């Protein structure tokens, strides 16, 4: 892929984070804390899951960014509508305003309804995410395997501004503490 030149500088929006997340001072890294991080509640915070949004909102154009997932057992990455549900239980699907992929229990899947099996020969340490707003496309790339395609959502109905979407995952196992990191351009 030759999408690298649409690179955008993503930063995390504290105010949207689940109350157990710890965001770095530069707003480029996030991890699960071992307890509530002593912040007030607000209607923006994801309540049920360890999720946070990027600060940037996209309504046009082509955008590309990279995320480091080194040594994580579980995570969700992609984009979502600015108006996604924050409170209670929900599934990651385009019907709910999410265009995402994840790792869970040693398999990779795309957030369709129902979910789609991905075929990855080289477990990724970094993921590239490409959005073409006008074309209605979200694509994922394996940076570890020379940028090979993972998955393309096409005919997307965004139906509003898009925000970068992150889930660091739970850490019941003690093996999923590692952060998500936004990689430098
Ligand atoms: C082991 C582990 O990852 N537990 C974290 C945890 C426990 C209970 N509720 C949580 N939230 C929904 C904020 C997070």
mmCIF file of C-alpha atoms and ligand atoms in Angstrom:
data_model
loop_
_atom_site.group_PDB
_atom_site.id
_atom_site.type_symbol
_atom_site.label_atom_id
_atom_site.label_comp_id
_atom_site.label_asym_id
_atom_site.label_seq_id
_atom_site.Cartn_x
_atom_site.Cartn_y
_atom_site.Cartn_z
ATOM 1 C CA UNK A 1 0.000 0.000 0.000
ATOM 2 C CA UNK A 2 1.065 3.652 -0.715
ATOM 3 C CA UNK A 3 -1.292 5.259 1.974
ATOM 4 C CA UNK A 4 1.643 6.364 4.289
ATOM 5 C CA UNK A 5 1.521 9.954 2.775
ATOM 6 C CA UNK A 6 -2.056 10.482 4.241
ATOM 7 C CA UNK A 7 -0.460 10.057 7.732
ATOM 8 C CA UNK A 8 -2.278 12.075 10.471
ATOM 9 C CA UNK A 9 -1.064 12.778 14.071
ATOM 10 C CA UNK A 10 -3.626 11.068 16.385
ATOM 11 C CA UNK A 11 -3.909 11.910 20.129
ATOM 12 C CA UNK A 12 -6.192 10.258 22.733
ATOM 13 C CA UNK A 13 -9.151 12.148 24.317
ATOM 14 C CA UNK A 14 -8.843 11.577 28.147
ATOM 15 C CA UNK A 15 -12.505 12.659 28.604
ATOM 16 C CA UNK A 16 -13.828 9.628 26.587
ATOM 17 C CA UNK A 17 -11.614 7.049 28.398
ATOM 18 C CA UNK A 18 -12.942 4.330 30.688
ATOM 19 C CA UNK A 19 -12.050 5.360 34.277
ATOM 20 C CA UNK A 20 -9.406 2.539 34.629
ATOM 21 C CA UNK A 21 -7.271 3.743 31.660
ATOM 22 C CA UNK A 22 -3.951 5.581 32.047
ATOM 23 C CA UNK A 23 -3.089 7.855 29.095
ATOM 24 C CA UNK A 24 0.511 9.077 28.769
ATOM 25 C CA UNK A 25 1.361 12.830 29.109
ATOM 26 C CA UNK A 26 1.902 13.070 25.267
ATOM 27 C CA UNK A 27 -1.622 11.477 24.743
ATOM 28 C CA UNK A 28 -0.028 8.846 22.388
ATOM 29 C CA UNK A 29 -0.141 5.756 24.703
ATOM 30 C CA UNK A 30 -2.871 4.084 26.760
ATOM 31 C CA UNK A 31 -2.921 1.104 29.119
ATOM 32 C CA UNK A 32 -5.252 -0.593 31.636
ATOM 33 C CA UNK A 33 -4.590 0.415 35.266
ATOM 34 C CA UNK A 34 -4.986 -2.045 38.189
ATOM 35 C CA UNK A 35 -7.763 0.218 39.723
ATOM 36 C CA UNK A 36 -10.061 3.279 39.087
ATOM 37 C CA UNK A 37 -7.750 6.189 38.025
ATOM 38 C CA UNK A 38 -9.450 8.800 40.350
ATOM 39 C CA UNK A 39 -11.287 10.799 37.564
ATOM 40 C CA UNK A 40 -14.917 12.101 37.747
ATOM 41 C CA UNK A 41 -17.631 10.303 35.651
ATOM 42 C CA UNK A 42 -19.048 12.087 32.536
ATOM 43 C CA UNK A 43 -21.512 11.078 29.782
ATOM 44 C CA UNK A 44 -18.576 10.632 27.257
ATOM 45 C CA UNK A 45 -16.736 7.791 29.165
ATOM 46 C CA UNK A 46 -17.071 4.187 27.936
ATOM 47 C CA UNK A 47 -18.481 2.483 31.104
ATOM 48 C CA UNK A 48 -18.359 -1.317 30.423
ATOM 49 C CA UNK A 49 -15.116 -1.772 28.447
ATOM 50 C CA UNK A 50 -11.522 -0.412 28.446
ATOM 51 C CA UNK A 51 -12.174 1.912 25.440
ATOM 52 C CA UNK A 52 -11.059 5.445 24.476
ATOM 53 C CA UNK A 53 -11.402 7.663 21.360
ATOM 54 C CA UNK A 54 -8.962 9.838 19.471
ATOM 55 C CA UNK A 55 -9.498 13.613 19.770
ATOM 56 C CA UNK A 56 -9.528 14.070 15.950
ATOM 57 C CA UNK A 57 -12.906 14.076 14.058
ATOM 58 C CA UNK A 58 -12.889 13.203 10.286
ATOM 59 C CA UNK A 59 -15.819 14.075 7.910
ATOM 60 C CA UNK A 60 -13.851 14.142 4.568
ATOM 61 C CA UNK A 61 -10.564 13.034 2.967
ATOM 62 C CA UNK A 62 -8.087 10.187 3.323
ATOM 63 C CA UNK A 63 -6.432 9.527 6.741
ATOM 64 C CA UNK A 64 -3.797 6.926 7.805
ATOM 65 C CA UNK A 65 -2.291 6.122 11.214
ATOM 66 C CA UNK A 66 -0.360 3.200 12.904
ATOM 67 C CA UNK A 67 -0.840 1.498 16.300
ATOM 68 C CA UNK A 68 1.706 -0.683 18.193
ATOM 69 C CA UNK A 69 0.088 -3.848 19.711
ATOM 70 C CA UNK A 70 3.375 -5.580 20.829
ATOM 71 C CA UNK A 71 2.823 -8.483 23.312
ATOM 72 C CA UNK A 72 -0.940 -7.863 23.795
ATOM 73 C CA UNK A 73 -3.312 -10.892 24.037
ATOM 74 C CA UNK A 74 -6.493 -8.867 23.331
ATOM 75 C CA UNK A 75 -7.440 -5.490 21.744
ATOM 76 C CA UNK A 76 -9.926 -3.797 19.327
ATOM 77 C CA UNK A 77 -8.814 -1.109 16.795
ATOM 78 C CA UNK A 78 -10.484 0.968 14.095
ATOM 79 C CA UNK A 79 -12.875 3.951 13.733
ATOM 80 C CA UNK A 80 -16.358 4.726 15.018
ATOM 81 C CA UNK A 81 -19.114 7.346 14.665
ATOM 82 C CA UNK A 82 -18.776 10.267 17.131
ATOM 83 C CA UNK A 83 -22.352 9.367 18.326
ATOM 84 C CA UNK A 84 -21.695 5.693 19.345
ATOM 85 C CA UNK A 85 -23.326 4.480 22.604
ATOM 86 C CA UNK A 86 -20.932 4.957 25.605
ATOM 87 C CA UNK A 87 -22.880 3.219 28.470
ATOM 88 C CA UNK A 88 -23.894 -0.425 28.939
ATOM 89 C CA UNK A 89 -23.307 -3.522 26.764
ATOM 90 C CA UNK A 90 -23.057 -3.368 22.933
ATOM 91 C CA UNK A 91 -21.418 -5.300 20.037
ATOM 92 C CA UNK A 92 -18.793 -3.799 17.690
ATOM 93 C CA UNK A 93 -20.651 -3.772 14.284
ATOM 94 C CA UNK A 94 -21.203 -1.264 11.454
ATOM 95 C CA UNK A 95 -24.939 -1.236 12.488
ATOM 96 C CA UNK A 96 -23.763 0.197 15.896
ATOM 97 C CA UNK A 97 -21.345 2.723 14.195
ATOM 98 C CA UNK A 98 -17.997 0.744 14.503
ATOM 99 C CA UNK A 99 -15.485 -0.392 11.745
ATOM 100 C CA UNK A 100 -12.999 -2.480 13.737
ATOM 101 C CA UNK A 101 -10.781 -5.573 13.917
ATOM 102 C CA UNK A 102 -9.618 -7.391 17.053
ATOM 103 C CA UNK A 103 -7.419 -10.032 18.613
ATOM 104 C CA UNK A 104 -9.123 -12.411 21.089
ATOM 105 C CA UNK A 105 -7.990 -15.907 22.291
ATOM 106 C CA UNK A 106 -5.272 -16.359 19.663
ATOM 107 C CA UNK A 107 -7.556 -15.456 16.674
ATOM 108 C CA UNK A 108 -8.013 -12.250 14.640
ATOM 109 C CA UNK A 109 -11.557 -11.236 13.522
ATOM 110 C CA UNK A 110 -13.237 -8.291 11.725
ATOM 111 C CA UNK A 111 -16.144 -6.605 13.588
ATOM 112 C CA UNK A 112 -18.890 -7.499 11.073
ATOM 113 C CA UNK A 113 -22.247 -8.957 12.300
ATOM 114 C CA UNK A 114 -21.644 -11.773 12.606
ATOM 115 C CA UNK A 115 -17.832 -11.451 12.930
ATOM 116 C CA UNK A 116 -15.465 -12.535 10.097
ATOM 117 C CA UNK A 117 -12.376 -14.771 10.515
ATOM 118 C CA UNK A 118 -9.100 -13.043 9.405
ATOM 119 C CA UNK A 119 -6.181 -15.001 7.851
ATOM 120 C CA UNK A 120 -2.888 -13.646 9.305
ATOM 121 C CA UNK A 121 0.311 -15.766 8.863
ATOM 122 C CA UNK A 122 2.596 -13.215 10.688
ATOM 123 C CA UNK A 123 1.121 -11.986 14.043
ATOM 124 C CA UNK A 124 1.292 -8.161 13.757
ATOM 125 C CA UNK A 125 3.291 -5.927 16.173
ATOM 126 C CA UNK A 126 1.950 -2.757 14.394
ATOM 127 C CA UNK A 127 -1.384 -2.214 12.528
ATOM 128 C CA UNK A 128 -1.969 0.486 9.879
ATOM 129 C CA UNK A 129 -5.520 1.948 9.601
ATOM 130 C CA UNK A 130 -6.622 3.748 6.382
ATOM 131 C CA UNK A 131 -9.939 5.626 6.030
ATOM 132 C CA UNK A 132 -11.307 7.020 2.736
ATOM 133 C CA UNK A 133 -14.347 9.038 3.824
ATOM 134 C CA UNK A 134 -15.750 9.768 0.315
ATOM 135 C CA UNK A 135 -15.220 6.152 -0.951
ATOM 136 C CA UNK A 136 -16.717 4.610 2.252
ATOM 137 C CA UNK A 137 -13.613 2.442 2.925
ATOM 138 C CA UNK A 138 -11.762 1.373 6.114
ATOM 139 C CA UNK A 139 -8.669 -0.866 5.531
ATOM 140 C CA UNK A 140 -6.242 -2.536 7.960
ATOM 141 C CA UNK A 141 -2.603 -3.394 7.129
ATOM 142 C CA UNK A 142 0.011 -5.675 8.820
ATOM 143 C CA UNK A 143 3.084 -3.333 9.187
ATOM 144 C CA UNK A 144 5.164 -6.344 10.527
ATOM 145 C CA UNK A 145 4.501 -8.279 7.247
ATOM 146 C CA UNK A 146 5.563 -5.545 4.699
ATOM 147 C CA UNK A 147 2.145 -3.768 4.928
ATOM 148 C CA UNK A 148 0.077 -6.803 3.740
ATOM 149 C CA UNK A 149 -3.748 -6.283 3.706
ATOM 150 C CA UNK A 150 -5.639 -7.663 6.717
ATOM 151 C CA UNK A 151 -9.197 -6.511 5.942
ATOM 152 C CA UNK A 152 -11.256 -3.929 3.952
ATOM 153 C CA UNK A 153 -14.738 -2.682 4.979
ATOM 154 C CA UNK A 154 -16.284 -1.269 1.788
ATOM 155 C CA UNK A 155 -19.664 0.427 1.102
ATOM 156 C CA UNK A 156 -19.401 1.888 4.672
ATOM 157 C CA UNK A 157 -22.321 4.079 5.807
ATOM 158 C CA UNK A 158 -20.405 6.383 8.229
ATOM 159 C CA UNK A 159 -23.527 8.584 8.790
ATOM 160 C CA UNK A 160 -21.489 11.189 10.764
ATOM 161 C CA UNK A 161 -18.051 12.371 11.835
ATOM 162 C CA UNK A 162 -15.560 9.525 12.547
ATOM 163 C CA UNK A 163 -13.182 9.180 15.523
ATOM 164 C CA UNK A 164 -10.171 6.822 15.934
ATOM 165 C CA UNK A 165 -11.330 3.952 18.262
ATOM 166 C CA UNK A 166 -9.187 1.893 20.753
ATOM 167 C CA UNK A 167 -9.853 -0.981 23.232
ATOM 168 C CA UNK A 168 -6.752 -2.025 25.313
ATOM 169 C CA UNK A 169 -8.754 -5.108 26.489
ATOM 170 C CA UNK A 170 -9.207 -6.580 29.968
ATOM 171 C CA UNK A 171 -6.256 -8.124 31.830
ATOM 172 C CA UNK A 172 -7.837 -11.085 33.724
ATOM 173 C CA UNK A 173 -4.894 -13.311 32.572
ATOM 174 C CA UNK A 174 -2.060 -11.034 33.768
ATOM 175 C CA UNK A 175 -0.706 -11.327 30.169
ATOM 176 C CA UNK A 176 -2.453 -8.265 28.623
ATOM 177 C CA UNK A 177 -1.035 -5.268 30.592
ATOM 178 C CA UNK A 178 0.993 -3.880 27.634
ATOM 179 C CA UNK A 179 -0.106 -0.462 26.205
ATOM 180 C CA UNK A 180 -1.527 0.506 22.771
ATOM 181 C CA UNK A 181 0.873 3.153 21.332
ATOM 182 C CA UNK A 182 0.383 5.554 18.425
ATOM 183 C CA UNK A 183 3.556 5.083 16.279
ATOM 184 C CA UNK A 184 5.523 8.091 14.996
ATOM 185 C CA UNK A 185 5.147 9.280 11.345
HETATM 186 C C1 LIG B 1 -8.580 -7.825 35.478
HETATM 187 C C2 LIG B 1 -9.201 -6.678 34.750
HETATM 188 O O1 LIG B 1 -8.808 -6.334 33.634
HETATM 189 N N1 LIG B 1 -10.169 -6.039 35.409
HETATM 190 C C3 LIG B 1 -10.450 -4.629 35.185
HETATM 191 C C4 LIG B 1 -11.877 -4.206 35.442
HETATM 192 C C5 LIG B 1 -12.670 -4.822 36.394
HETATM 193 C C6 LIG B 1 -13.960 -4.377 36.583
HETATM 194 N N2 LIG B 1 -14.512 -3.372 35.894
HETATM 195 C C7 LIG B 1 -13.747 -2.756 34.963
HETATM 196 N N3 LIG B 1 -14.321 -1.746 34.267
HETATM 197 C C8 LIG B 1 -15.483 -1.970 33.424
HETATM 198 C C9 LIG B 1 -13.804 -0.391 34.327
HETATM 199 C C10 LIG B 1 -12.418 -3.154 34.719
#
